[PDB]
Design a protein around this ligand. Structure first.
Ligand SMILES: *C(=O)[C@@H](NC(=O)/C(=N\OC)c1csc(N)n1)[C@@H]1N=C(C(=O)O)C(=C)CS1
Length: 324
């Protein structure tokens, strides 16, 4: 039997279509995963191929939790550690934030989506250490979901990395993943540090995962990510009434469309809830929005909010705080 829940599939389809129409976008995808099993509860695309598995993107901001997790897991960084987050140079290249802050701690780096802060955390590790970590998350790795045309994405050999490329990878550029690979990678955060296999078939036994970080680290990262959907957070448009939600949002770049070259901006939102004890991962992409907003949170947050809220309701999960 398929793991897909027709109620969630219908909800995802309707909310996706609503956003694609409103923002006059080219295409879109929603993936909903069981956060503790890797089973696909919904997977919808606009008409055409199964872009969730075929289309790889440079993920942008949604990748940031991972170098943060690696840094915390290593013991080299504490959540309260503060970093100089002013723009800086690597050779002639500049790494800078959208909103400039002189200093941020790790919670702030997550909350504000700081490219500088994330790059500095990554810079504490060798190219090999970072590559091995990204590889362990499934970047450049086949999922073997049994979907046809499944992209492995791109993770360049660390032996070829320049310092600027290590830096840009930490904030989601210079490596490429499909939306389903991104959703899968988020299971390290939701399933207490263990990467789950992805399946569209109902699983008869407990899927065993590969441990990537400690469970304590995964828990701390989920906590940090709640700041993204609270006041002051880059992902407020994706807050879900009655729940705490860990999430990231940002603009990804599509360089490959099917079997062809491309260059498109893709609004992205991915997250999980309830944040302390997650049941669901929802991931959303909308390709080339051209109306009523072009910043990613406003385009995709509302899709995430409705799909997440509705999925939790459908599965019977009680709100953890009174509704506003
Ligand atoms: C993550 O996606 C992050 N985006 C960026 O830092 C970039 N642009 O943001 C406007 C960026 C850095 S290098 C490059 N090619 N683009 C956060 N995302 C957004 C967004 O909606 O794109 C923000 C508004 C906050 S910063």
């Amino acid at each position: 039997a398929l793991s897909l829940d027709q109620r969630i599939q219908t909800l995802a389809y309707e909310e996706l279509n609503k956003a694609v129409e409103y923002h006059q976008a080219k295409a879109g995808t929603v993936v909903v995963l069981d956060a503790r099993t890797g089973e696909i509860l919904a997977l919808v695309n606009t008409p055409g191929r199964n872009r969730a598995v075929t289309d790889m993107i440079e993920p942008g901001s949604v990748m940031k939790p991972f170098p943060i997790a690696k840094a915390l897991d290593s013991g080299k960084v504490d959540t309260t550690d503060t970093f100089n987050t002013l723009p800086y140079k690597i050779g002639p290249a500049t790494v800078q934030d959208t909103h400039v802050y002189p200093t941020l701690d790790v919670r702030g780096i997550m909350q504000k989506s700081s490219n500088v802060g994330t790059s500095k955390l990554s810079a504490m590790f060798t190219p090999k250490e970072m590559y091995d970590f990204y590889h362990d998350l499934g970047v450049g790795v086949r999922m073997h979901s049994g979907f046809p045309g499944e992209s492995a994405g791109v993770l360049r050999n660390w032996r070829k990395w320049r310092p600027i490329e290590q830096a840009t990878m930490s904030f989601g550029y210079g490596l490429q993943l499909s939306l389903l690979q991104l959703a899968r990678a988020y299971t390290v955060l939701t399933h207490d540090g263990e990467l789950l296999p992805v399946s569209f078939e109902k699983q008869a036994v407990a899927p065993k995962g590969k441990r990537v970080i400690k469970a304590s680290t995964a828990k701390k990262v989920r906590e940090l990510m709640v700041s993204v959907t609270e006041a002051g957070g880059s992902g407020i448009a994706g807050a879900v009434d009655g729940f705490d939600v860990g999430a990231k949002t940002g603009t990804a770049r599509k360089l490959v469309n099917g079997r062809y070259v491309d260059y498109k901006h893709v609004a992205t939102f991915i997250g999980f809830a309830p944040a302390k004890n997650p049941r669901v991962i929802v991931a959303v992409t909308i390709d080339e929005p051209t109306a009523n907003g072009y910043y990613s949170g406003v385009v995709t947050g509302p899709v995430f909010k409705q799909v997440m809220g509705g999925s939790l309701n459908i599965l019977g999960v009680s709100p953890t705080k009174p509704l506003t």
